[PDB]
Symmetry: C2
Subunit: 377 residues, 2 copies
């Protein structure tokens, strides 16, 4: 419409100048348990902005995300609605961060602002009224329920898609668990940030678990090995690499002798998982490297996005950014580098969400083009 574009603009403007205020206040006016609680909100808001850009790219390149997602052909969500809700959550996040930097009210402590921000973010998603995108949030909530109880539902495309998006937003779950940990060891006036009791691995791999059991259930319904089992083979390796990094870290802590062979085995599993996910992305999730492309030498038969430079840069971008996701996951799950941890993670998490954005535009393209995931017909 027009009021929606106006609100997109208003929210984007307030957001950009609030970010300027934020940078200036950070330069002038143990910070780690503070930038370890706001990283979740930051990644989520960046993901919603980039999902808006994804919806625009789909709607304009030609691919239809309304038939694929089993969405309703009327009452849709164009990119402006995602931009507006992302900008709203971003304004809320910026305000909470600024109230944490300054201290507007003296009687209220500084630990209530992350609590209040996430309370608002959760209340906006379970608002029982008929307001603030009632149908949209009540679709997303049913989808979240059908995802987090994976083996008991037939896997549509929204299920598989959100499972993978969560497979990229693992830092948000890690930060939720870390904040739940923190607000038991805070001081209303340091067991967390380390593997308390294997919890930093269970919460680290729970999206891999969701997607792995979803693929297994798709196999059970289809009784077709390929690809519902070769695809479980790309999500099981996350379990292996995470648990082996954690075991190697604990053995280095205790000073055992097999720490060297554990490091060798972990680097083997890490490189195997990186190569697995990379070849999968470049072969089945994207359909590239096809045997039938004359002038599209390393692409499909027909392409949807105009400039082949897009594909040619996205390939190498994914090749570089897939080795960063596995490294970030391993480092976050291993308490080995006290200083490089939570800064390499803070630098490699937005890059991971960006990689997931690119993967979204060339997975949905390949889907609409070739019925890669056998979901219809």
């Amino acid at each position: 419409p027009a009021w929606t574009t106006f609100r997109v603009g208003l929210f984007c403007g307030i957001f950009i100048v609030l970010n300027i205020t934020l940078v200036l206040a950070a330069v002038f006016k143990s910070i780690w348990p503070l930038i370890r609680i706001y990283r979740g909100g930051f990644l989520l808001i960046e993901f919603l902005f980039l999902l808006g850009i994804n919806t625009y790219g789909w709607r304009q390149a030609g691919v239809n995300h309304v038939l694929i997602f089993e969405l309703n052909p009327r009452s849709n969500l164009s990119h402006q609605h995602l931009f507006e809700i992302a900008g709203f959550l971003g304004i809320l996040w910026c305000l909470s961060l600024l109230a944490c930097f300054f201290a507007p009210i003296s009687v209220i402590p500084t630990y209530v602002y992350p609590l209040a921000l996430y309370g608002f973010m959760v209340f906006f998603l379970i608002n029982p009224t008929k307001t603030f995108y009632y149908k949209s949030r009540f679709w997303l909530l049913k989808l979240l329920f059908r995802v987090f109880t994976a083996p008991f539902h037939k896997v549509g495309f929204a299920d598989f898609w959100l499972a993978d998006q969560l497979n990229s937003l693992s830092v948000i779950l890690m930060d939720l668990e870390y904040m739940i940990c923190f607000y038991s060891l805070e001081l209303k006036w340091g067991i967390c940030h380390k593997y308390t009791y294997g919890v930093r691995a269970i919460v680290q791999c729970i999206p891999a678990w969701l997607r792995f059991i979803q693929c297994l259930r798709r196999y059970r319904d289809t009784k077709r090995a390929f690809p519902h089992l070769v695809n479980a083979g790309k999500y099981s390796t996350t379990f292996f690499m995470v648990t082996f990094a954690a075991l190697y870290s604990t053995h280095k802590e205790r000073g055992h002798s097999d720490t060297m062979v554990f490091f060798y085995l972990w680097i083997v599993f890490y490189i195997i998982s990186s190569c697995y996910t990379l070849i999968w992305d470049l072969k089945m999730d994207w359909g590239l490297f096809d045997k039938n492309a004359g002038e599209n030498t390393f692409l499909r038969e027909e392409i949807v996005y105009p400039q082949k430079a897009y594909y040619y840069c996205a390939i190498i971008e994914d090749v570089i950014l897939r080795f960063a996701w596995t490294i970030q996951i391993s480092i976050t799950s291993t308490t080995l580098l006290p200083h490089s941890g939570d800064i390499i993670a803070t630098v490699f998490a937005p890059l991971e969400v960006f990689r997931r954005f690119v993967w979204n535009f060339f997975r949905l393209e390949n889907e609409h083009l070739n019925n890669c995931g056998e979901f219809r017909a």
Copy 2:
């Protein structure tokens, strides 16, 4: 369009949060020669916002401002374009004011920011390129030239309209002259703010002079006394009241004995000018109080704006806000109250621009409805 609504939103958002920053910095972080240089920019930006609201009210109530203004039926300026240019100038004003409150750069003094702000505001209006509303600004500049050389041009409707708008934005000219005065008596490391040599009266009445000589020239072309001479009678009294307030102030300063009779004569001329402008507004500039209105008892035959409550509140609003304009002009022209001056003016200038906004919507309505100013046919 849609990008225009987006930019309107972006500028309005940056503007609202910059105003929040401004209020907070003013509360926490001789200020008078600083809020006496930014009042011009503030009144101008408020006037452009309210002119946007005026254009919307015209375009939606039914009255056409494209035939009246002799504007081009294609390539118009809807209210969004005025909102966007007003928001842009408002962002620039807020940034200059904030750079004055803080001191981002130490080597640059604090007196260059008003200079730079007004340099930008003037360069945006004389930009010789084909960018940033080239046709709009090149119409406005030709109109400003035809206004400020009044007796040598046939008075259209844009001429008479801008002459009156300037007759309401006298504080902007006063502040321009005051800043020109100041930057000769500043210290790059107090004759101003008072009638230097009758200059605070010449600059105070120069819009009244523009409009008075325009009315005289319309009389010369039409040879019709009414109303081109009874209308000069409502702009001549500004000369009288201003010069008599200034003379009474100077005689109180020198301690002469006729200061009491000068005060009596000034209050007589002030009340006569207030009543003159009020009856004129309510009778000819608005067409209200007509002899033919059954159910519209104190209105016209036919009305354009839906709710008669609008007219009924605007009448009393103008009755109250016309006695404030004359008081503000007299006080600004008389150095009698050192403290109440420049605060009563700062409080009564935005109210005056608001009164001019209301007058614009019921003058243009009456114009399109009844051909009040004999400008066409």
